[PDB]
Each structure stands twice: as C-alpha cells, then as structure tokens.
Design a protein around this ligand. Structure first.
Ligand SMILES: [Ca+2]
Ligand SMILES: [Ca+2]
Ligand SMILES: [Mg+2]
Lengths: 450, 168, 129
C-alpha cells in the first residue's frame, strides 16, 4: 500500500476503504468535504456475473455502459483462469465474472439482469540487476550531495541492528515492475542503519536504482543531503519493537520525524513535502496533524490524516479475513493491484532461497509488460484539462476511456478551495459530480511501448 | 471488585477574570511542596495565579493534605496530558502556561526526556498558542523541541536544560 | 517559577553562565554538523566586547588599599569608575584566626568592613590587547 502511494499519493486510503464494510448515511450538519469523503467510504468491492447482453462487446464499451446506464464501475474481469485489470481489446465472454465498485451488493445486481429493453526476472514482470553489492550503494553526506536526486523516493527507516526484519523487498519491487519504463523508474534512497539494512540486502541485490545512507532520518543534515524537498514521497517506517510501556510513546520517533520535516525550510516549504507515515498505534494519529479536532474514540478511517492519505496502519486490514473468505478472487485482485503483479510461479522461485532470479528476454516475456498500472493525472494542462473548468465527472470518465483507455477511480481534491495544501480522497464520485481545475484523478493507465 | 475507587475527576469550572497555570510531569510530594514554596512566596510580587496539577496517579495521604492546605490556590485532577479529553477538563486553552516537571533522579534520562517531549507535542496539538516550560535532562534532546512547527521561543516557550545549566 | 514570572530572567542566566549562546547558535548546533566556524570580519569582532565573570584579590594592586579595614561601598565606586568593574559579592575566609576555606557573601552592604584577604566577584570588561 505504501509503495503504490509513491506512484499516486492518497492511493492507500482509497484501497483501505474499498475493502471495509461501511454504510453511508448523509448528514447536513458537517462540512461538504466531509460529506463527499464519507460517500466514498461507503463504496465496497463486489463480484457479479455479467449479463448475456455484454457478450461480444469489448471491455472498454462494457465498462462505459455500466458507468452510464447501470451507474456501476467495472474495473476488472476474469478471463478463462486469470484476472485482468482494465484490459484493452478483451471481448466479454459468456458467464464472465465482473469486478464492480458499488455502495452495496444490491446495486451490482443490476449488472446480472439487463438487456436492450538479463534485463528482467524469470516471469518478466520486474526489472533486474546483476546482484550489486551493498557497499556499492552506501552513500556518504559528501557524495549524496553531488548526486542530483529529483522525483526520487526517500525511505526513512527507524530500526535497531537487532530489530525484527521487515519486508523492504515488498516496498521496492512494486516500484520496480516491468510495467514502468527504465527511464521513468524512481530512485529509492533508504536512510537508516546499514547494520540493519545489511540483513535485508539479500533480497535487494537484483533491484536497480537503490541507494543507502548511514544515518538517522531525524537529522536535518541527512534529509538535506538527499533532497527531501524534491522527493516524490517520503516514507517513515519503524522496525523497532514497541516497549509496551505506554501506547502514546510507541510512535515517538515517527511523530517527531514527521514534525521535523514539516518545519524544515529550503533555499521550499517543508509542509509541501509529500509524506506517508505508518503508525504502530491508531491513537497516535491525532498528533500527525495540528489543524484538526482530535477525539480519541473516533475510528481511524474517519480521521483527517487518514482521509488525506498521510497516515496508515495495519488495523485497517482486519476486514480482509471476511473479504477473502467470501471470495478468493477478491484477494487475488488486491495482490495483483498493489504488488505490481506476483504470479504463483514467483512464489516458488523466491521460496527456494536463492533470491530473485533473472531471465533472458524473449517474445513471450515482453508480452507480460502490457498491463495497466496505477497513476495520477492533473487537470492543470493537457487535452483533459478542459474538463476541469466546472465540468462533470461523467464527461471526463467517458472521454478518457475512449481516447487513452484510462479508467477513472476517484478524485484527489483540495480540502479547502478558498489556504492549506492538503487533499483528501473521494472514491467513485457520481457522474454528475462537479469538477475543479485543481482536482487530481486516480487512473489506471495502459502500457505504452516506447 | 469492591476494592476500587475513582476519587478525582470532573472539569475545571470557575469564574472569569482570574488566571491559572497547569503543572504536569513528575508530580510527587516533594516535587509539589518544593514548587509551591517557591511559587507562593512573600518576596514574590502578589499576583493571584491558580496552580492546577494533572497526574495519572492518585495522590497519597500526605499529598492530599498538602492540597488541602492550599485549597484556595491549588487544585488537583486525575488524568494524562496525552489524552485530549483531560486537556479540556483542566482548560489548557485558557491557561497562561503549562509547566512540565522532569524526574531528575531517573535511571534512563533518554526515556524521561522522550516522554516529556511527547507531552509538549500533545499540548501543542490541542492548542498551538500556549506557553510551555519544560525541564530537559540532556542537551541533545533540545533539538527535537526546536523542530516542532508550533514551538516559538519569541512567544514565551522556554527550555530549561538541567545538563546545560549544571555544567555551566 | 523564575522563568514563568519573567522569561527575561532565564535569558540573563543563560547569557551569564554559558558564555553567550544566541538563538542562532541553537539552530546551527541542532542541524547535526557540529560547531561551524566562520571567517573573522568587522561585525564579528565587535561581539567579543562583553563583560565576563572573574575574581580579583586585594593582596596587591591599585585596589589593594581598600582591603586595609576599608568599606565595601568605597571599593565598589572606585572600581566601577576606573576599570568599569561591577562588584557582586565577596569570597572571604571562614576563619581569620586555620583552614583555607572561603564562603560566599552575596551583595554585602556598602558599610561592610573589608579584609586584606578578601576576594571580590567582579564583572570585568573586555580589553582588546
Ligand atoms: Ca456500503
Ligand atoms: Ca490533531
Ligand atoms: Mg468501504
């Protein structure tokens, strides 16, 4: 979830809310942005069999029809099996299982009855490197300064040399998927103790563009040496074991690091640095932001830092027990959407113990790179910019789908439009939703060779 | 089941016009008596300022008697700074300043400083415009407080580092 | 209590015992690069002109004649006008008839009787050269 947030800020909040059963009730005695956000939280994930009327037409025509006529968002289908997310040129077959986003399971019933009346790995889904050593990636303050890091990803890691191992491999591989061109890859800089990173370097040898800096993320000198003001996303991760002395003291380093960066100034604003922080305790989310009213009994998904995508916790993933039990394909869709694609063959290769194994590029492997990916677009400029001038969400969805084959999932809109540079997440707004020139759209973008 | 009691509680409600301060952190018998003797002294200029104490532990018999002898000036409430509910009870947003007392005789000064710093974060989270005076055991932990966006020495925020002052 | 009733009180103590720690020095040290030097210029050398804490003895010197059963007030005025020294207190032998132990007297009255063996806490100006 954190890795996907680097490619599209606020994506973790949208994914977390899509798999938690929430009933949405409108309330007038609250802010408009709060009402819009709560409408998105009511959207969940459902599976339904497509009507026989959909047989023959491609996916692009099928999902457009559901959005307009049926008011349902179709993003993935099951092909005889495999799950494909927004496939282009994929004709709908008989008894095809469709994946929908809707308020409740009653809404998706309308989709059943309806009529007229070595450069890569072995699987070829991740970029590969010839097993670079750790010492070749360790950077010092003097040599990290001369290196120009623009649009990179900074991983702030708090970990003792004997801290339990965390899956830093699970954070880098989604950023190293073959669906991204090599020139568009994002450099990864890990700020932390190499005595801990050394234990986890075995799984990171074959991943390109990884940098290591010995130090502490709480130090302003280290942060300035990696250009935190120019990074695309800053991740504050803590691998230290909680002392259990006090729950409010479990996230001292994580909160301090967030506040430290937020107050930094550069020769430009520390508050403009995009950060996402994972919290050991749910109750510590109150200290992440200052311009809000904190209530200890409020649910985590209702808090402002979570709604803006700057906070995360493992306590939002309990509902995956119920989601997986009622539908195994639901869990497969999530894994194929956040891990960059992890086929069951990749499971056995990694379980052997030899690490990631590369493979020679051939005709069958290069076809695997043609799949949709998670990204964000802005209505500031471009052919789609004219929809931001007080346009409609439905108009933008249809035009983007037909031209560029883009599927709009939600909006990432400024909290206040009259200020603070804070944006919240709206999941699946109605087709009559009014757009703004400053709005950002979560999209599923096809792979363009070249 | 029967061996339980909730003695201290309730919100601070008084008249308007007078001013008060909130004291938290290390609240013991000698921590309060030493503080009150210097705070309420004859040589000091006579100003009516109320002292409010907020600690998560129930005071013992000796501490309760000390509060009784200062009934018209000192009041005690049971709670913690980290809880926003308890902050509203003692009316932090209207207090002149919040004083955080440190445990000087602590086995781990690093642990004591970290807990005290988190209290300032909680106080500043509730209200950005509040004076905070805090004791710090080590000088290198002063950098964390200065990095807080709401910390401002020009507005009355002060750090009294015992290590810096003792060796000075 | 001292800091709460007056913030300037704490500033005076810090500027008196730390040798002078301006708020700019706080941010430089908090970065993590340690103490950073600077090239001497005209504006920097003017900062060296400030008072410092020291002790003087009435054993010998121009001020020694005040130790012969003199008055504290007489010593305070003469030292202030001539050398610009401010007398804060005395550091006097516990017994004068022994042990080499001296105690501290803070701000004695102007009629206090001095001794030839007394030491004076003073604030001494900076003399270039
Ligand atoms: Ca719902
Ligand atoms: Ca808050
Ligand atoms: Mg939901």
């Amino acid at each position: 979830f954190i890795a996907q947030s680097c490619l599209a800020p606020g994506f973790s909040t949208m994914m977390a809310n899509l798999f938690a059963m929430r009933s949405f009730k409108t309330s007038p005695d609250m802010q408009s942005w709060t009402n819009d956000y709560l409408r998105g939280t009511g959207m969940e994930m459902y599976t339904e069999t497509l009507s026989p009327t959909f047989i023959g037409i491609p996916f692009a025509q099928a999902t457009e029809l559901c959005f307009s006529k049926l008011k349902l968002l179709l993003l993935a289908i099951e092909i005889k099996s495999k799950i494909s997310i927004n496939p282009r040129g994929a004709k709908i077959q008989a008894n095809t299982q469709g994946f929908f986003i809707a308020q409740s399971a009653d809404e998706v019933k309308r989709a059943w009855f309806y009529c007229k009346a070595m450069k890569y790995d072995s699987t070829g889904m991740f970029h590969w490197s010839p097993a670079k050593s750790l010492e070749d990636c360790i950077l010092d303050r003097n040599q990290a300064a001369m290196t120009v890091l623009n649009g990179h990803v900074v991983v702030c890691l708090f970990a003792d040399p004997d801290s339990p191992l965390i899956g830093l491999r699970n954070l880098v591989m989604p950023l190293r998927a073959s669906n991204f061109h090599y020139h568009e890859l994002k450099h990864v800089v890990i700020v932390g103790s190499v005595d801990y990173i050394r234990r986890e370097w075995k799984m990171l040898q074959n991943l390109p563009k990884i940098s290591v800096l010995n130090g502490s993320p709480l130090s302003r000198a280290d942060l300035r040496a990696v250009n935190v003001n120019l990074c695309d996303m800053c991740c504050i991760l803590s691998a230290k074991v909680p002392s259990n002395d006090d729950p409010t003291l479990a996230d001292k380093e994580a909160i301090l690091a967030s506040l430290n960066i937020k107050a930094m100034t550069f020769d430009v604003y520390g508050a403009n640095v995009p950060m996402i922080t994972e919290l050991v305790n749910d109750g510590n989310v109150q200290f992440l932001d200052q311009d809000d009213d904190d209530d200890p009994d409020t649910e985590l998904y209702l808090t402002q830092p979570f709604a803006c995508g700057t906070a995360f916790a493992v306590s939002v993933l309990d509902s995956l027990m119920s989601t997986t039990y009622f539908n195994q394909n639901a869990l497969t869709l999530i894994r194929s959407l956040i891990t960059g694609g992890a086929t069951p063959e990749l499971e056995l290769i990694l379980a052997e113990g030899a690490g990631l194994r590369g493979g020679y590029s051939t005709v069958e492997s290069l076809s695997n790179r043609d799949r949709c990916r998670v990204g964000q677009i802005s209505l500031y400029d471009g052919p789609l910019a004219q929809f931001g001038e007080c346009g409609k969400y439905g108009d933008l969805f249809v035009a983007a789908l037909k031209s560029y084959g883009m599927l709009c999932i939600g909006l990432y809109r400024f909290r206040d439009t009259s200020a603070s540079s804070k944006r919240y997440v709206i999941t699946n707004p109605p087709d009559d939703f009014s757009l703004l020139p400053t709005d950002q759209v979560f999209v599923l973008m096809q792979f363009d060779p070249g | 089941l029967i061996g339980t009691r909730a003695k201290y509680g309730g919100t601070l409600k008084n008249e308007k016009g007078r001013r008060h301060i909130v004291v938290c952190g290390h609240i013991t018998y000698e921590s309060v008596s030493h503080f009150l003797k210097d705070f309420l002294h004859e040589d000091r200029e006579d100003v009516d300022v109320e002292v409010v104490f907020l600690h998560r532990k129930p005071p013992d018999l000796e501490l309760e008697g000390l509060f009784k002898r200062h009934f018209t000036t000192v009041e005690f409430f049971q709670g913690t700074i980290m809880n926003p509910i308890d902050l509203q009870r003692v009316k932090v947003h209207e207090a002149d300043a919040c004083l955080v007392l440190a445990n000087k005789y602590c086995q781990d000064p690093d642990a004591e400083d970290a807990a005290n710093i988190m209290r300032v974060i909680s106080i500043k989270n509730y209200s950005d415009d509040i004076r905070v005076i805090i004791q710090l055991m080590q000088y290198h932990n002063k950098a964390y407080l200065l990095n807080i966006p709401s910390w401002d020495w020009k507005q009355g925020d002060d750090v009294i580092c015992l290590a810096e002052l003792k060796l000075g």
